[PDB]
Design a protein around this ligand. Sequence first.
Ligand SMILES: [Mg+2]
Ligand SMILES: [Mg+2]
Lengths: 324, 324
Amino acid sequence: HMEGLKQLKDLPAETPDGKKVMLAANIGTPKDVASALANGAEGVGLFRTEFLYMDRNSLPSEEEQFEAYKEVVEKMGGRPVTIRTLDIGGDKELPYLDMPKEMNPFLGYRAIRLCLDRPDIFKTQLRAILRASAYGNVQIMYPMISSVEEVRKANSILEEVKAELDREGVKYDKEIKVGIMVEIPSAAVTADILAKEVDFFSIGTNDLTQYTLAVDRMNEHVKEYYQPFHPAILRLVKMVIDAAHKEGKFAAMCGEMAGDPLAAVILLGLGLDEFSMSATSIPEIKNIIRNVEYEKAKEIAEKALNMSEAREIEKMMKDVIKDI
Amino acid sequence: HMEGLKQLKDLPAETPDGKKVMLAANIGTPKDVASALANGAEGVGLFRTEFLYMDRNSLPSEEEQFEAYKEVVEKMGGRPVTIRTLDIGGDKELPYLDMPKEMNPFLGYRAIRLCLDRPDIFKTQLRAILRASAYGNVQIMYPMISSVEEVRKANSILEEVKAELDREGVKYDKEIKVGIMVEIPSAAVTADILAKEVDFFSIGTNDLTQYTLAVDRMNEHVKEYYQPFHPAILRLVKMVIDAAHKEGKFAAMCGEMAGDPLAAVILLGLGLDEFSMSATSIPEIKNIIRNVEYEKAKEIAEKALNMSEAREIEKMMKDVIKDI
Ligand SMILES: [Mg+2]
Ligand SMILES: [Mg+2]
C-alpha cells in the first residue's frame, strides 16, 4: 500500500489496523516551514532556536525573537510548534557571552545550565515564546535536563515571566504545554519522576546515544562506538515512552533516529506518539507506518528489545524494511 | 558497638544479624599495599595501573609490569587483587603514544578503546597480569566498557595471550576471573546482558555519575550538577547489583561512593558484595556495617530508592549516620 508523495501529503500516518502517530518537522529557522508543510508535517516537534544567537555581536532582543517565533507559529496554522530553549555551549563562538574554556564542553556549562546561570538571557527568550503563544499552538521544551530539580528551577522563571506579562496586560497561552528533551541518561532513568512534572517528553537520541555510550558523536576516532541501536538506547527509549504514558503524557522523538526508516517499526511498536524529523524524511516514514500493522510492529519491537547486539537489531530491521 | 582501629583491623565487616561484605582497597602503586593491609583490607578491589605508563618516554615492558603486579599479589597473600587494564586517554601526556587532540577526551579515544586499537600495548599488559596470577589471587578488570561486544573483543585477545603462554610453557591461573568496570551508563542499563559474560562487576561511580548526569567531574563551572546521590545513580547501582546476582556473580564498587559513610547503609541494603576504597576509609565503613542490621539497611535502601531528590536522600543518610 505504498503511496506517492502527492497522495501521501494529506494522508495520516496510520497503520492498516488503525494506530495513528504524529509526524512533525525539525526546523532551525522560520525559512524551514515551507518545506515542512510541503512534506505534510503535522507540527514542529523541534524548533532549534540557536539561529537567533549565532553569528552576531549581541543577544537577540525579545522583539526579534518574538517576531521569529510568531512567524513560525502563524504559518503552522494551529499545528503544535515545540520551541526548544537556548541549547548552546562554549564550543560555539558567541562574542557577547564569555564562556569558560572547558576540557569537555559536551559535559559542561551549556544549554539549560547556561540559562539558569544567566536568567537575563532565559527570561527574554521565555517572554518571546510566551508572547508568541498568543498566536497559535506553542509548546516549550527545555534541553539538557538531568533532574526534576532543574525543571522546577526553570519553571520558576517561567512563572515569573508569566506574572510579568500578566501585570503588563500582555497575552499568552495560559495552558501552554512545557516539556523536556530527554538526552541526558539520568533523565531517561528517572523519567517516572520527571513525568509527573512535565507535559511531555521529546527524546533527543543524538545526544542520548552520545552520553549513554560515552562517545562524542563528532569524534572520528571513536565513531564506531556510536551505536544508536545499542540495546541500552532502545531500553531507555522504551522507559521514557512508558513513563510518559503511565502519567498520561505524550512521548516524542526528535533525534535523527525518528527519521530513520530502520527505526520506524520499533518506535511504532514501542508506542512512540510523535516522530519529529527533517521534513523530507516524513513521507518515507509515513509510508512505512501505513504499511505495517500496529500489532505486528509491537511484536517486532518486542523482538528487538530481546536482542543483545546492535548489529543483529539492525540486520533484523533491514529485513523488515525489505518486506515492507 | 563502635570499635577502635586496633580492634577493628581483624574484625569482619559483618552486621549484627550476620550479613558479611568484603572491604577492599583501591591502590595506584605497589607502595600502597602496606597501608591497605594496616587498615584491614581483605583484598585490592582496584589496582589502577596508570602509574606504569606515566612520566616516562617508552611503554612499560612486560617484565617491569610483571614485577610490579607480582609484588602486590604476593604481599596480599592470597587475598584477591583486581587489576584494571590501561585506563588513559589523550588528556594525559604520554610522549610515546601520539594521541589525537579531542574536543571531549572523556567521550573519546581512551582506555579499552585505546587498548583494542593498540593490541600490542594490551597484549603486553595482559601477559604480565596473567604471569602474575601464577603467584596469587588475581582478577582482571576492563575499564570503560560500553557493550558486551567489547568484552568479547577484549577476551579474544586475552585468550590469544593465554594460548601464547601455554606454548611457551609459562604458568598462569587458568581460572582467573575477568570482569568489567561499570561506569558507562550503557553498561549499567545492559548489565543483564553483560552479567552472562563477565565474572563480576565493579561499579565505577566516579565516572558513572559523570556520564549519567553528563557532568565533567573536574569542571568547576558545573560542579553543582555532579550529584552522586541522584536517584538515577542509585537505580543504576541497584540494576548492576541485581543483574550480577541473577547470574550468580558478584558486584563490587570502587568509586569514591564505596568509601562514603553516607552511602554505606544504602550500599549494604542494596546487597553490594564488595566495597573498594582508599585504605584509610575501611575502618570507618566497617564500623558502620558492624553497627547496622542488614534488615534495617534493606529498609533504608528501599526508602532511599523511593525518594526523588538527591538532597532528601543525603539528608536521610545524614540522620542515619547520626543514629549509628
Ligand atoms: Mg541534543
Ligand atoms: Mg573511571
